[PDB]
Scaffold this active site. Sequence first.
Site, PDB file in Angstrom:
ATOM      1  CB  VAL A  41      -1.025   0.003   1.178  1.00 56.16           C
ATOM      2  CG1 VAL A  41      -1.863   1.278   1.206  1.00 56.16           C
ATOM      3  CG2 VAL A  41      -1.937  -1.213   1.125  1.00 56.16           C
ATOM      4  CE  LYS A  61      -4.937  -4.814  -0.577  1.00 53.77           C
ATOM      5  NZ  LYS A  61      -6.260  -5.338  -0.158  1.00 53.77           N
ATOM      6  CG  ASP A 105      -9.361 -11.512  11.675  1.00 49.29           C
ATOM      7  OD1 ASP A 105      -9.217 -11.991  12.816  1.00 49.29           O
ATOM      8  OD2 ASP A 105      -8.415 -11.043  11.014  1.00 49.29           O
TER       9      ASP A 105
HETATM   10  C1  LIG Z   1      -5.474   0.515   2.525  1.00 52.28           C
HETATM   11  C2  LIG Z   1      -5.698   1.852   2.410  1.00 52.28           C
HETATM   12  C3  LIG Z   1      -5.111   2.731   3.346  1.00 52.28           C
HETATM   13  C4  LIG Z   1      -5.252   4.136   3.270  1.00 52.28           C
HETATM   14  N1  LIG Z   1      -4.677   4.993   4.084  1.00 52.28           N
HETATM   15  C5  LIG Z   1      -3.905   4.483   5.078  1.00 52.28           C
HETATM   16  C6  LIG Z   1      -3.223   5.283   6.085  1.00 52.28           C
HETATM   17  C7  LIG Z   1      -2.576   4.528   6.998  1.00 52.28           C
HETATM   18  S1  LIG Z   1      -2.724   2.830   6.729  1.00 52.28           S
HETATM   19  C8  LIG Z   1      -3.688   3.093   5.313  1.00 52.28           C
HETATM   20  C9  LIG Z   1      -4.305   2.188   4.393  1.00 52.28           C
HETATM   21  C10 LIG Z   1      -4.179   0.779   4.386  1.00 52.28           C
HETATM   22  N2  LIG Z   1      -4.731  -0.038   3.490  1.00 52.28           N
END
Ligand SMILES: c1cc2cnc3ccsc3c2cn1
Length: 252
Positions: free
Chosen positions: A23, A37, A131
């Site tokens: 990501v 992502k 989960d």
């Molecule tokens: C997907 C999208 C995200 C978007 N913004 C943030 C910001 C910190 S973790 C994270 C994310 C983690 N996975």
Amino acid sequence: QSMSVKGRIYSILKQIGSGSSKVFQVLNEKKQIYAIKYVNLEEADNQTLDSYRNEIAYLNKLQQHSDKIIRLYDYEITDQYIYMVMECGNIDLNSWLKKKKSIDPWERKSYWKNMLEAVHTIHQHGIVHSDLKPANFLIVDGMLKLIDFGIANQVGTVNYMPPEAIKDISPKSDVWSLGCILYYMTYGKTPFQQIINQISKLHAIIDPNHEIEFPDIPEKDLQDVLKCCLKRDPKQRISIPELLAHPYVQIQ
Ligand SMILES: c1cc2cnc3ccsc3c2cn1
């Protein structure tokens, strides 16, 4: 570095997360900030691909229903990769709670309401996450948002696991997990955090004679929510629609 998603160029600012997925914090041509992502489909089987496609379709559908679900702006799916353009958060709830010494009662209530709304929405579409952990939530503009739905194939923690999941899953399973997150936000630890040994911990969660301590706090409504969520019998556990009508969420 740089990357293309559906003909649009994104400049990479930094790497946020990472197994066969990474990501990143990115900038578009109009200088706006997003999260991309990237998922590698190189060694992904049909069951995996199908779980990934199912999660993407649910995320994209459930967009319209609640602002407490992460925004999915666009995506590019091929046979080798997935690129998903989403909104960028400030921090995930797990990293935030770990850094923070104490949580203010107003922000905790505000966060609890958002958690209920996001989970309620998924349950209304037939989805039980199964989960839930603070890592599944993201802080975006003082607003807590759910990042995933539990469909696609903190790493494997049992602190938020309901007793029925250890024995074997209804919406009441998500209620237990949400109660564990509120219990962390209240008492600074999960109900069974003090037990190192995973076997002895799984034995304590299912054990009815093992009393979960609920130390007295100035918020009696908050104590009642915790006791209601943390009922070992799913039949005796409070539901999400009932939690949304509770005094903790409504009074004041
Ligand atoms: C997907 C999208 C995200 C978007 N913004 C943030 C910001 C910190 S973790 C994270 C994310 C983690 N996975």
